[PDB]
Amino acid sequence: KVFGRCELAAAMKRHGLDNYRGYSLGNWVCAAKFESNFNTQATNRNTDGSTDYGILQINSRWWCNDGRTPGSRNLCNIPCSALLSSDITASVNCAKKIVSDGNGMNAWVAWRNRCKGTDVQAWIRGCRL
Template identity: 40%
Template sequence: MNTLLLSLLAFVALAAAEELTVPHNETNGGCSTCGGSAYVDIASACSRYSGWSQSCCQCIAKHESSGNSHACNKNTNGSTDVGLWQVNSMNWASCNGGNPPCDVSSNLQCAIKVFQWGHNTWKLWSTCGGCGCCGSK
């Protein structure tokens, strides 16, 4: 009986440890494309473009990267999302010469293009629903 209890406790501890080490965007999601962390003021970054809702932009950036302009996430389909707005690697050729847009300025330019490709909405970001911004500017 004690062996069963110890085994169960060990399993729970292992599961908890694995859960704590699962990568998330704000902790660079298991990739080092942009290297490390560089937290920025989200409101200031969003205000660089007046063509979108500032509240939606801030919510999207908060949910995508927690303000880490070097956030990086490897996706299950093999693509990579980087930067404050987590621009996907499938878009880098069209917005940053094929290079990962790791700095705020290049990530912003890519985010603006993706926003425009979505008919000036946030619908191309998976976090738009949680922000209530899928059909919003």
């Protein structure tokens, strides 16, 4: 599913991402924009052979099982395919564990390089939340 910006903002808020670990909704929407362009079906192979899955491009190296990432963990205890669903519940639940891991949203290199310190509130502008 390719979410609308305000559609994804509402979904993330409903699943309690708005100000989760101190990160306002616009940070999460910004990260999803540059990670996935709001496409739940987005997959991207990393140089280390791991893969990134879904709206928040969650890595099989640590967080989900895809069966093809030697020496990896599955700390969200989910098949990586569950992160491609039109229902973002598994992506959000897993993202809450990632952002709690100690480096906050710096875990998302695209957030650090493209969202951090910017006017992230722009991403929820016009939305009825």
